[PDB]
Design a protein around this ligand. Structure first.
Ligand SMILES: Cc1cccc([C@@H]2NC(=O)c3c(Cl)cccc3N2)c1
Ligand SMILES: [Zn+2]
Ligand SMILES: [Zn+2]
Length: 116
């Protein structure tokens, strides 16, 4: 039974792993996922994506204590990737970066949860 304070530290470590991850070229794969697109300049996004989310919102939820489990933030990471893979075309760099973010999150989650 983790305390809220313990859980927060785990969630912060998971988010940290996402936001420091770089491609082989050195670019932060999280760059384009920090902030949702403008409703004014990208109105189609909000017609297509039913539950928009970004990394700033996930970070806010960590700070708010909105997540009561690692699973809950995992599901928000899944949603982040699913939205990018719905809106942006397959083979787009945003599409691949979305899968990479998921890949990094679950690898770090396993490292944390299984280390002994
Ligand atoms: C118009 C356009 C062009 C290039 C990239 C995006 C990108 N697509 C996302 O789905 C996304 C997610 Cl999930 C979270 C935060 C910002 C995002 N914008 C949007
Ligand atoms: Zn396990
Ligand atoms: Zn250990």
């Amino acid at each position: 039974s983790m305390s809220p304070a313990y859980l927060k530290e785990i969630l912060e470590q998971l988010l940290e792993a996402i936001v420091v991850a770089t491609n082989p070229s050195g670019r932060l794969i999280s760059e384009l996922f920090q902030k949702l697109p403008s409703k004014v300049q990208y109105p189609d996004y909000y017609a297509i994506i039913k539950e928009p989310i970004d990394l700033k919102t996930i970070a806010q939820r960590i700070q708010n204590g909105s997540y009561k489990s690692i699973h809950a933030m995992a599901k928000d990471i899944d949603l982040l990737a699913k939205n990018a893979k719905t809106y942006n075309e397959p083979g787009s760099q945003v599409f691949k970066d979305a899968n990479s973010i998921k890949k990094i999150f679950y690898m770090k989650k396993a490292e944390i949860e299984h280390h002994e």
